[PDB]
Amino acid sequence: SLAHTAAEYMLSDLKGLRLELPLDRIVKFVAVGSPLLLMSLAFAQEFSSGSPISCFSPSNFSIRQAAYVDSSCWDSLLHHKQDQDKMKSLWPHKALPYSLLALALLMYLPVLLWQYAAVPALSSDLLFIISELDKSYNRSIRLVQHMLKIRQKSSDPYVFWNELEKARKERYFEFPLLERYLACKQRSHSLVATYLLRNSLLLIFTSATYLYLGHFHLDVFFQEEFSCSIKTGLLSDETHVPNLITCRLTSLSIFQIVSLSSVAIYTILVPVIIYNLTRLCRWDKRLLSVYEMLPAFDLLSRKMLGCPINDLNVILLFLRANISELISFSWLSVLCVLKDHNIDTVVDFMTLLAGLEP
Amino acid sequence: SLAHTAAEYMLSDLKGLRLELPLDRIVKFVAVGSPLLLMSLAFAQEFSSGSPISCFSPSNFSIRQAAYVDSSCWDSLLHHKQDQDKMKSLWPHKALPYSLLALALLMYLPVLLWQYAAVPALSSDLLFIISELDKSYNRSIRLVQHMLKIRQKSSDPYVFWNELEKARKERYFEFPLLERYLACKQRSHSLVATYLLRNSLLLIFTSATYLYLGHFHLDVFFQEEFSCSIKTGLLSDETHVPNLITCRLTSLSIFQIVSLSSVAIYTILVPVIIYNLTRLCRWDKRLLSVYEMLPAFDLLSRKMLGCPINDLNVILLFLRANISELISFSWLSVLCVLKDHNIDTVVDFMTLLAGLEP
Amino acid sequence: SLAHTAAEYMLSDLKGLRLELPLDRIVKFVAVGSPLLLMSLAFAQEFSSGSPISCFSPSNFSIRQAAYVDSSCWDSLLHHKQDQDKMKSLWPHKALPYSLLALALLMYLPVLLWQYAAVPALSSDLLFIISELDKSYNRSIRLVQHMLKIRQKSSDPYVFWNELEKARKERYFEFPLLERYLACKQRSHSLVATYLLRNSLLLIFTSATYLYLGHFHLDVFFQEEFSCSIKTGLLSDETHVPNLITCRLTSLSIFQIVSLSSVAIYTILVPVIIYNLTRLCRWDKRLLSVYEMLPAFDLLSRKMLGCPINDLNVILLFLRANISELISFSWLSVLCVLKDHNIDTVVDFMTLLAGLEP
Amino acid sequence: SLAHTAAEYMLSDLKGLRLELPLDRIVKFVAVGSPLLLMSLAFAQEFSSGSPISCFSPSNFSIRQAAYVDSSCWDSLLHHKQDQDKMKSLWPHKALPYSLLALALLMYLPVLLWQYAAVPALSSDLLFIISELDKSYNRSIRLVQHMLKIRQKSSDPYVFWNELEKARKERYFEFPLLERYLACKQRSHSLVATYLLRNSLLLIFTSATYLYLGHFHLDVFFQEEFSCSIKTGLLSDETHVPNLITCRLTSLSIFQIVSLSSVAIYTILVPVIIYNLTRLCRWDKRLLSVYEMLPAFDLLSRKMLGCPINDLNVILLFLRANISELISFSWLSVLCVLKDHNIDTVVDFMTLLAGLEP
Amino acid sequence: SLAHTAAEYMLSDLKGLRLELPLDRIVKFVAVGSPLLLMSLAFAQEFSSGSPISCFSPSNFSIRQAAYVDSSCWDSLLHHKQDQDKMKSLWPHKALPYSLLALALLMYLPVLLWQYAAVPALSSDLLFIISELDKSYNRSIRLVQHMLKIRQKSSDPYVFWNELEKARKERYFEFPLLERYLACKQRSHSLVATYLLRNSLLLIFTSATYLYLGHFHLDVFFQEEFSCSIKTGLLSDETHVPNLITCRLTSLSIFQIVSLSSVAIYTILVPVIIYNLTRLCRWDKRLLSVYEMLPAFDLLSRKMLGCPINDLNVILLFLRANISELISFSWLSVLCVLKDHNIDTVVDFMTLLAGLEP
């Protein structure tokens, strides 16, 4: 079916960076593939419907005549009630796959906008941050690997605290170009617009589905039998039944079940995206206690102020997801025992030297 | 069929770590793939159903009329018993594929929540622990080898009973970071909760399946014949049978066998999960006699006290499966002849140099 | 469906250079693949049409006679209206797949034309320009290295407003080699209009679609029944119905939705190509500030004069996508915010030596 | 068919070691795939059964009435014999594919038991044993070569009959870790239990198949006609045949041939299992003569006593299978001409020297 | 069809050794694939059989009654001839695919027997022989090269007829282990039995096929019209024809064609196997003349005495096939011009240094 091909092409699972959160990933699957899956079950496989409409034609009719009769009403679904002559339409029955595929394709717009308008600028400059925050450790592997050796002969903090203080606050161990970089991305507001827009389109599309099911569905929902007319044109001058009565919809159950499942999936989907939206309303202070002492991570910790709608929010949010690839997947992750003013300072430094990598 | 594609994408069998225990793999495979296989076998392959319901129409009816009749009841299963007019439903016969697919999808949530909420941190801990445990080889044979070489040069107390403290309490024998890490780890309880909840979800889903098969099934089980009505609408003003009796279900045997198989497989499946849960109720003391002599492995056996519900328990359980990968898949495993107080400790030592690796 | 094969072969997704604008790629995709999607949806999958026409033959006819009836009228679509004898044709219903396939294959013509007549000349110029423009490493920081060290010896305006006049006005800082190329390349006007012609081709194609839809469609839009004639030949000498009335078009709905979708998608598409056409109508000076300071990139900002219809426009626009690939972007990226005259001349310098890459 | 997919997934043919006896492999193949082959041939391909039952309905009945007739008997297989009213059922004809599939899944369980309960420990043991065995070469040719080189420099007792004791009881010729390892492993009884259960499960399963064929089959074996009844419900008040006689089974020949093939194949298979079981009842001394002269292989032949039910028997049986991989697939295998006391112990020597590998 | 799958799995076309004579390969291919090809051709593809039996029921019968007539005799093929009551059966018409599949499976037994019981030992022998004979190049040219270099310095007996003795009876020119190995393999008679059985089982199977075609075929070969009986049970008390004559077999042509092709192909195949059997009955000495000059190959030509049923025979037959892989595919193969007593031996010699390879 077309659903399988769409799922293969659409919604199918730099060079190492993770540019997309597992929450948003799961939301994208559960919002895109669900209508495709419902289409696949509905119009194939388990329920081979065959003819979606059946008619109780009079016995005098021939087989070809009955075929004409029950083929001339599916494209003319009109309830010719005796109550003037309010011909109520049941066009959602013939348009259900259309609506499902339209919803499926509408679900793919926000991810396209996120992939097109924000991925390149994000990717290039985060490659810049990862390409710069690897030599900060290379400083340590090349100038504090003897920090123990010059110290170990003598004692007292005069050979601990100030020996490297001017070798950590210097020309060699600094990155002031990044200071201006983060200071300025604190001011810009372009990248947050993509995220908020991505969430808002999914919200408005879910509301659109809600209203669509509210107006057209839920009205012809317990209706299964209607009377149609055939003598409404060139056939009016013929001696046969003026009204073909009791055309029964065979696929009412799948209609009801598809509608109910479509309601339920979006009802359970709604809270996840609002949680993702409120994720950006606060400044995260989970492990900032250790970030303030780390040399390069200190400037991540100091610019922790002001209104929480800034590009630095998104940058740090994506960093925390990429902070454990292979190299920061180290003592950074290992430092879980320093989470419990002269002894805490020296104990923390020996643990830093205990993980002396090579 | 959707069964083949679902089994392909879903339930399809770092870089070396074993993040799943084999019994868990077996139980997830059995509990997930079985509904797929049953629904595939039932509604395809050997028994071509055709139409699940057959009707005994009066001979006056035309072929198209009979098609309308047997199509207007497969979506309107309502037994018009003469006993007022208790219209008992027979919906599960129609809803069986939906029930199977919903059960299959529901059973797969626990593995998702495990792989998302436990894999990263647990993998980090395993990699760290194995990274410092692989060092322990050249710490008992590269550090203690001058013990028997000194033992032959002296006799008793100062050479074999007064050397076991100046060498064991030595800075090349002591691992502070690992001990502090284990001390911090055994206090944490975050990781075990995932294990308990993933098992409890399996139990609660099995109980829900039992409830579903107990209330909806087991009632329409020996019923194969039910009389329907068609003149319950505008067809009331027509000259034909008022109660079309004897619309017969065709797939009753399939219904029975599917229900019985679903009951039996989960009945035999239940005890494994409770066994897995109670595996954490005790401290494993099978081979601690050999850990307590090794430098690094003494710490693992030392912090075995108090209530066993801690992350240290699960981390040891998942480590034990990985102590036999390629490097600890060595002398440690070869140390099987040490399971049978001055001759014991020497005999334990030249066996160490027997497997001197290079 | 053959539409799947066409989408697989056509419209299927040097060695590093990007030669297509992403917006142009999206326009190409939505213009080419859409008619294939409508054709595949319309005549397969969800809607098993069967026979697009049905006939209400008299009951005297046999099965094969009715087969002759409904086969002799599908290929002879002529409404024998009683209003002299204007047999209106109903041929668009038959020719819809031909029209869709013709439109889809017509959409690909501008793509092949641009691929064949633009890319060959374009690629060499772009790669050459990149080859010389990447040279600033051994042009700027090697040749402007003796600026900061020179500063501290002397004082401000006689150390940084006198050595500029000789250093930049010196052979090794000069790039007139590129200057003759760029100057002679702007005299050319043969290739400037290739892009304009490429856009106008698809614009004329869209106009053709509009005229075809407004002329032949939109007339047979609510006509679903018609009376045919069978005794319009050698059967004229027979005793049967002369006007075999009531031939009903069962697939009118598919016709209406495909026509409406074809109108709507192109209606949304039209302004995008106009925007792309207007993109060439102005000088882009968004980041001209950074270009003029760097030696090599200074020439790019230098030659922005005259009418904006020049080849250099095409090179620069297709180059901005390729200028940001790996190397030239890195230096241009590190500045971004810097858009805010003696301190400015130096603060931009230690930023350059902050990112000394090795 | 499902049989093809089942054969694809299951029953499908470290890093170089052979963990399965070829006889056990062919036993597994012929014991698992045979019911799959019978399933594939019986209900597909050559004999498109269609409806496995046919009914001699009265001529007055309509087509749909006959469809109801032959659909209401296949799921209600009950012979309404006039002999009270012993309604003998013919359920095996329906349950044959289910029975075959259940047998197929059942007979594969011992493979899982062997793969899960014995493979890792066996692999560790064999890996240790070959890892130590490969070293035995440069200890009898690199280390004993100065026996014949000294032999011509002297004569008889002190050069060939007294040097074989000083040169055999030396530390370079001793393997005490091996000796203790095999001494401890011969006491264990865990590994043999898995193998004996593996054979016993096959034997019990074959006996269960014999009982199943004996009781339920072999009774409905020459019956092809049975009189059914339809007036056993709401059709009791109807004017039709009270005993619709003569329902004929179409696939009786398939039934008989499948039963005969099923019994015959396992009857042929039985002796191989008991042969495999009794292979453990004796100590194998086929080439023990050559083992006793090699340094490392002497200990293998030394612990050759007592009751043969030990894990040592299994480890040696599996060792002989991998004794010809790439390195022992050499001089040891070449040592076949030494199978035909002063000349014997020197003639066997220069043969070792001639095969000096590099 | 299972014909395609069976040809895919079986009959499908160390690391360099050729362990099968290609005549055996082609004869196995022809003997195994021919029944599969016949099965695929007969019951699929070109000749869409439909139903292998047609019945002439009286016109009073209904359509379902006629279907019961058709299906009540195909499984009860019994010719009720009026000649007492010899119910001659035509079961081979039904059992032809069964016979073809059984024959195809039976053809595979000798192949697996040879692959399992003889391949390892023969492969080991060939590996050892090739490994030792590949050293023979630098033993007749790098050892014997100082013959003509000395022959030109002397004249006749002591340089070309007395130096051929002290040099050919020299340690570096001798391969005693090869001679002893070949002598040991001469007495053994294990591998020859495998080849003899591999041919004998094929002969026995061909004779069995001839007997099968003789006894059951060739009797019902011109019979296509038989009269059956249907009132042979519960139908006896009915009013219809007692002898429902003329059930005509519509697949007699394929029966005759497949029988003729099956007998013809085996008749053609018979001589090849007996030729292969006789191939082992003589010592092959086609190029023994050039073998007796070479150092190591002289031993091979030496041991051709006595009865030709020995293992060295089969070894040399397998050698002559793989003597031309990559390194003996050299001067040895080039030694074709030396096939035409003092000038011959020198002429035999400088050709060796002419092909000095490097």
Query: Which among C89, C81, C71, C74 is positioned nearest to C249, based on CA atoms?
Result: C74
Of C45, C324, C354, the CB nearest to A177: C354
Contacts of B60 in chain A (CB under 8 A): 59
For chain C, the residues whose C-beta falls within 8 A of a C-beta of chain A are 4, 22, 40-41, 45-46, 54-57, 59, 61, 63, 66, 70, 224-227, 245-246, 248, 250-253, 257, 324, 329-330, 333-334, 336-338, 351, 354-355
Distance (Å, whole) CA B151 – CA D150: 38
Q: Alpha-carbon distance A71 to A92, whole Å?
A: 18
Q: Residue A5: closest CA among chain C residues belongs to which residue?
A: C4
- Reported as type and span, the H/E element at residue E272 is helix E252-279
Chain A hits for B76, Cβ within 8 Å = 224
- Cβ of D2 and B334 within 8 Å? no
Please report the sign of the dihedral spanned by the C-alpha atoms of residue B257, residue B263, residue B266, residue B268. negative
Check chain D for breaks (C–N over 2.5 Å) and list the residue before each, or none: 13, 83, 340
Of B45, B246, B355, the CB nearest to D235: B246
Decide: helix, strand or coil at residue B42: helix
d(CA B256, CA A174): 75
What is chain C's length? 358
Return the sign of the alpha-carbon dihedral for residues E183, E184, E186, E191.
Answer: negative
**Cα dist from D138 to C204, D108, D287, D290, D300, whole Å:** 87, 45, 22, 17, 18
Max Cα-Cα span within chain D:
119
Cβ atoms within 10 Å of B152's Cβ, excluding its own: 8
Q: Is B247 exposed, middle or buried (0-12, 13-18, 19+ CB in 10 A)?
A: buried
Question: What is the Cα–Cα distance from E28 to E34, expressed in whole angstroms?
Answer: 10
Q: Give CA separation, B27 vs A82, A259, A333, B282, in Å.
A: 61, 34, 32, 22
- Residues of chain B neighbouring D180 (CB-CB closer than 8 A): 337, 351
Place of tokens 């801690």: B310
CB contact under 8 A, B46 and D2: yes
- The two tokens of residue E155 are 């004249």
| Torsions phi, psi for B320 (to 5 deg) | -55, -40
The answer to whether the Cβ–Cβ distance between B250 and D75 falls below 8 Å is: yes
Spatial distance between the Cα atoms of E173 and E299, rounded to a whole number of angstroms? 12
Residue type, D11: L
The region, left, alpha or beta by phi > 0 then psi within -120 to 50, assigned to residue D85 is left
Query: Hey, of B234, B258, B311, which one would you mutate to test binding to chain A, going by the most A CBs within 10 A of its CB?
Result: B234
> In whole angstroms, what is the distance from residue E322 CA to residue B96 CA?
64
Q: How many CA within 13 A on the CB side of residue A313? A: 24
For chain C, the distance separating the N- and C-terminal CA atoms, rounded to the nearest angstrom, is: 56
Distance CA B104, CA B121 (A): 28
Torsion sign (Cα): C16, C19, C23, C27: negative
Whats the size of chain A, residue-wise? 358
- Cβ neighbours of residue A243 under 8 Å, at least 6 residues apart? A80, A227, A228, A229, A230
For residue C34, which amino acid is it? Answer: S
- Rounded to 5°, the CA angle C184-C185-C186 comes to 95
- At D58, give phi and psi (nearest 5°): -65, 155
User: Considering only CA atoms, which of E9, B26, B45 is closest in space to residue D109?
Assistant: B26
* Inter-chain touch B235–A329, beta carbons under 8 Å: no
Residues 6+ apart with CB under 8 A from D353: D141, D145, D148
Q: C268 CA to chain A: closest CA distance, Å?
A: 15
The two tokens of residue C154 are 């002397």
> CA–CA separation, C215 vs C206, rounded Å?
14
Residue C130 has φ and ψ, to the nearest 5°, of -60, -40
DSSP A112-164: HHHHHHTHHHHHHHHHHHHHHTTHHHHHHHHHSTTHHHHHHHS-SGGGTTTTT
CA distance C96 to C102: 10
Residues with Cβ within 8 Å of E157's Cβ and at least 6 positions away in sequence, in order, are none
- E→D interface, C-beta within 8 Å: 1-2, 5, 43, 60-65, 67-68, 71-72, 74-76, 94, 97-98, 101, 116, 120, 124, 127-128, 176-177, 180-181, 183-184, 233-235
Lookup: tokens for B257: 């066998």
Which residues have CB under 8 Å from B113's CB, separation 6+? B194, B197, B198, B201
The residues near C102 (Cβ < 8 Å, ≥ 6 apart) are none
**Which own/partner contact pairs does B183-187 have at CB distance under 8 Å and 24+ positions apart?**
B183/A337, B183/B303, B184/A336, B184/A337, B185/A336, B185/B125, B185/B310, B185/B311, B185/B312, B185/B315, B186/B303, B186/B310, B186/B311, B186/B312, B187/B310
Residue D246 gets the label, from left (phi > 0), alpha (psi -120 to 50) or beta, of: left
C-alpha E217, offset from chain centre: 27
Q: Do A354 and B176 touch (CB under 8 A)?
A: yes
According to DSSP, residue E158 is labeled: I
Enumerate the residues of chain A whose CB falls inside 8 A of the CB of residue C251. 75
Q: Residue type for E181, please?
A: Y
SS3 A192: helix
Question: How far is the alpha carbon of B250 from chain A, nearest alpha carbon, in Å?
Answer: 15
Residue numbers in A near C253 (CB within 8 A)? 75, 94
Which residue, among C242, A347, A318, E72, has the nearest Cα to D248 in the 3D structure?
E72
Size of interface D-E (CB pairs under 8 A): 73
| Cβ pair A225, A247 in contact under 8 A | yes
Compare all CA atoms of chain B with the CA of D70 and give the residue at the minimum distance: B54
Question: What does the alpha-carbon distance between residue D104 and residue D96 come to, in Å, rounded to a whole number?
Answer: 12
Q: Are C224 and A65 in contact (CB < 8 Å)?
A: no
Q: Phi/psi at A54 (nearest 5 deg)?
A: -135, 150
CA distances from D22 to D29, D31, D82, E112 (A): 10, 14, 56, 12
Q: For residue C336, which residues of chain A lie inside 8 Å, CB to CB?
A: 181, 184
CA distance to partner chain D, nearest, from residue E60 (Å)? 9
Q: Quick one: tokens of B59?
A: 């001979």
If we measure between CA atoms, which residue out of A223, A9, A1, A6 comes closest to residue A103? Answer: A6
D52: which 2 tokens? 């496995």
Cβ atoms C78, C247 nearer than 8 A: no
**How many angstroms from the chain centroid is the CA of residue E195?**
10
Contact at CB, E72 and D63, closer than 8 angstroms:
no
In chain D, the residue whose alpha carbon lies closest to the alpha carbon of B246 is D234
Rg (CA), chain A: 33
- Give residue E320's identity as a one-letter amino acid code: R
Rounded to 10°, the helix A311-322/A176-185 angle is 120
Per DSSP, helices labelled H in chain D are 2-9, 22-42, 63-74, 91-107, 109-117, 119-133, 148-151, 163-166, 176-185, 191-215, 252-278, 288-291, 295-302, 311-322, 331-334, 344-354
DSSP A39-101: HHHHTSTT-----SEEE---TTS-HHHHHHHHHTTGGG-EEE------EEE-HHHHHHHHHHH
Angle at the Cα of B283 (from B278 to B285), degrees rounded to 5? 125
Among chain B residues, the shortest Cα distance to D233 is held by B225
Determine phi and psi for D224, rounding to 5 degrees: -130, -15
Q: For tokens 């509608």, what's the residue?
A: A259
- Is-contact E296 E133, C-beta < 8 A? yes
Picking from D226, D197, D32, the residue whose alpha carbon sits closest to that of residue D115 is: D197
Pick from A183, A142, A193, A144: which is nearest to A166 by CA? A144
DSSP reduced 3-state for C12: coil
CA distance D76 to D74: 5
Q: What's the rounded Cα separation, in Å, for the pair B71 and B83?
A: 26
Compute the distance between CA of residue B137 and CA of residue B334 in angstroms, rounded to an integer. Answer: 13
Q: How far apart are CA D351 and CA D332, in angstroms?
A: 11
Residue identified by tokens 């079916």 is A1
- Packed helices D295-302 and D176-185: angle between N→C axes, nearest 10 degrees: 20
> Which residues on C lie below 8 Å from A5 (Cβ)?
4
Q: Is the Cβ–Cβ distance between C274 and C157 less than 8 Å?
A: no
User: Is the CB of residue E192 less than 8 Å from the CB of residue E314?
Assistant: yes
Of A279, A299, A293, A358, the closest CA to residue A332 belongs to A293
Query: Chain C residues with CB inside 8 Å of A240's CB?
Result: none
| H or E, element range at C323 | helix C311-323
**CA-CA distance, C311 to C190, in Å (whole number)?**
9
- Chain D residues with CB within 8 Å of chain E CB: 4, 22, 40-41, 45-46, 54-57, 59, 61, 63, 66, 70, 224-225, 227, 245-246, 248-253, 257, 324, 329, 333-334, 336-337, 351, 354-355
Approach to solving: cryo-EM
To the nearest whole Å, the CA of B49 is away from the closest chain D CA by 10
**Residue E244 burial by CB count (10 A; 0-12/13-18/19+): exposed, middle or buried?**
buried
Nearest C-alpha neighbor of B125 from the set A291, A329, A327:
A329
Write the single-letter amino acid at D133: L
Q: What is the largest CA-CA distance in chain B?
A: 118
CA dist., res. D110 & res. D116, Å (int): 10
Q: How far are the Cα atoms of C135, C177, C186, C324 from residue C128, in angstroms, in the given order? A: 12, 12, 16, 16
Kindly list the partner chains of chain B, i.e. chains with 3 or more CB atom pairs below 8 Å: A, D
List chains touching C (3+ CB pairs under 8 A): A
By C-alpha distance, which of B180, B205, B216 is closest to B303?
Answer: B180
- The answer to whether the CB of A4 falls within 8 A of the CB of A40 is yes
Calpha distance D162→B58 (Å, rounded): 111
CA torsion sign, D205 to D206 to D209 to D210?
Answer: negative
Helices and strands counted in chain E (H then E): 17, 5
Q: Do D54 and E65 lie within an 8 Å CB cutoff?
A: no
Q: H helices within chain B, ranges in order? A: 2-9, 22-42, 63-71, 92-106, 109-117, 119-133, 148-151, 176-187, 190-215, 252-278, 288-291, 295-302, 311-320, 331-334, 343-354
Contacting residues of D for B56, CB less than 8 Å apart = 65, 68, 235
Task: Indicate yes or no: CB of D72 within 8 angstroms of CB of B248.
Answer: yes
Could you tell me how far CA D327 lies from the centroid of its own chain? Answer: 28
Length, in residues, of chain B:
358
Place of tokens 């079309």: B244
Distance CA B274, CA B276 (A): 5
Q: Name the residue of chain C whose CA is nearest to A63's CA.
A: C63
Please say whether the beta carbons of D57 and B40 come within 8 A.
Answer: no
Contact E71 D40 (CB under 8 A): no
**How far apart, in whole angstroms, are the C-alpha atoms of residue B28 and residue B41?**
20
First to last CA, chain A: 56
Query: Residue A184 in contact with residue A311, Cβ under 8 Å?
Result: no
For chain E, the C-alpha Rg in angstroms (whole number) is: 33
Structural contact between residues B355 and B334, judged by C-beta atoms closer than 8 angstroms:
yes
Nearest-Cα distance to chain B for D224, in Å, is 21
Interface of A with C (CB under 8 A): 1-2, 5, 43, 60-65, 67-68, 71-72, 74-76, 94, 97-98, 101, 116, 120, 124-125, 128, 132, 175-177, 180-181, 184, 187-188, 233-235
**Could you tell me where the beta strands, DSSP code E, fall in chain E?**
53-55, 78-80, 87-89, 225-226, 247-249
φ/ψ (deg, to 5) at E79: -85, 105
Distance CA E60, CA E240 (A): 10
- The minimum CA-CA distance between B354 and chain D, rounded to whole Å, is 7
Give yes or no for a contact between C296 and C129, defined as CB atoms under 8 angstroms apart: no
Pull the structure tokens for residue A113: 């906008």
For B2, residues 6+ apart whose C-beta sits below 8 A from its C-beta are A40, A41, A45, B101
